[PDB]
Amino acid sequence: GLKSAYKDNFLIGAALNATIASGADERLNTLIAKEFNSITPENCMKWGVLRDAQGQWNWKDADAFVAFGTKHNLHMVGHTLVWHSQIHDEVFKNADGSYISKAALQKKMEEHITTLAGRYKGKLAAWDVVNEAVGDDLKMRDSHWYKIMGDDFIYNAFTLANEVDPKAHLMYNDYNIERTGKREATVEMIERLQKRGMPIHGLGIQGHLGIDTPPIAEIEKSIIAFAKLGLRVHFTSLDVDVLPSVWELPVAEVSTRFEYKPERDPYTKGLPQEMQDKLAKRYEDLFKLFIKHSDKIDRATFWGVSDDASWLNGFPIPGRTNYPLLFDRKLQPKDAYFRLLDLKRLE
């Protein structure tokens, strides 16, 4: 499998949803053990999923995930301690809408990280400590975290995670940092936090790619730039969106562009071979680049195992039929998978 083909290069990972991590599906258990040597929880360790609005914890799924990784001796990545998404507004706000104090929020962060990173200390090899702190306008993201705490929200999260599990490989993770602009903004942020003494070991590039964009040359500049910070580079959430893109439509469509329309969902009956070919070539191009820079890269994780489970079926448009991953809806390897193997088989 892939994990073996790529053994001398980097870990090969997959995000697992709660149904898969339950271990009920023997077909998937077999596939995962063959193909992947790292796993990430797709949702179950996110603050708002693990805890309710009153802060109460329910460990069923997160424990199942860690049990699965332990059973199969898989490298496990915690995802994610501090993030602005999938987190209750109650963490940040009084019921009247007003923000709580920086001190009150610090206490919550302290409890959350001490509890969550503590429970799995030594079991999870790595943590996404902070996710998506740079906004797409290249300023710091204007989240409640940042508005209340300033950049201490980042500094404190890493410091805390490091005190709780000193052996964990701590990462900052983000999307679109493959691209000029956000790349350099991220470098500058991390640089200044590093000079402040923040513990950080790795840099996660999500790798939510389109079938065409961004180009290999852009991703290459990112691998190089982030490695220069003395950080290990991980590709954390790989997928390739093969469906009509609505990201850059004219202003008249700004609000309607996320609506379902049949023309935006052209492959409900299957992905035609010509698109399989393009998808395979795109993955081949990407993994050629990763191999080239294997000295800088610790891991390539896919954001799912097979196409049926991909979040891209419902994002950014609900109810589409996307084909972003290496295994199809019948758990069979797609052409892309064989191209990835051949890169290694043939030297």
Ligand X SMILES: O[C@@H]1[C@@H](O)[C@H](O[C@@H]2CO[C@@H](O[C@@H]3CO[C@@H](O[C@@H]4CO[C@@H](O)[C@H](O)[C@H]4O)[C@H](O)[C@H]3O)[C@H](O)[C@H]2O)OC[C@H]1O
Ligand Y SMILES: O[C@@H]1[C@@H](O)[C@H](O[C@@H]2CO[C@@H](O[C@@H]3CO[C@H](O)[C@H](O)[C@H]3O)[C@H](O)[C@H]2O)OC[C@H]1O
Q: Binding residue for ligand X (CB under 6 A) from 197, 247, 262, 263? A: 247
Minimum distance of ligand Y from residue 128's CB (angstroms): 7
Q: Binding residue for ligand X (CB under 6 A) from 213, 215, 230, 272? A: 213
- Which string of x and - marks every residue 77-106 that binds ligand X (by CB under 6 A)? --------x---------------------
> Is residue 180 near ligand X by the rule CB under 6 A?
no
Residues 248 to 287 in contact with ligand X, rule: CB under 6 A: 248
Contact 145, 153 (CB under 8 A): yes
Contact 15, 300 (CB under 8 A): no
Q: Binding residue for ligand X (CB under 6 A) from 3, 51, 112, 208? A: 208
Q: Which is nearer to ligand X, 111 or 136 (CB)?
A: 136
Minimum distance of ligand Y from residue 197's CB (angstroms): 26
Residues 118 to 177 in contact with ligand X, rule: CB under 6 A: 175-176
Minimum distance of ligand X from residue 46's CB (angstroms): 10
Q: Which is nearer to ligand X, 176 or 294 (CB)?
A: 176
Q: Binding residue for ligand X (CB under 6 A) from 212, 218, 259, 285? A: 212
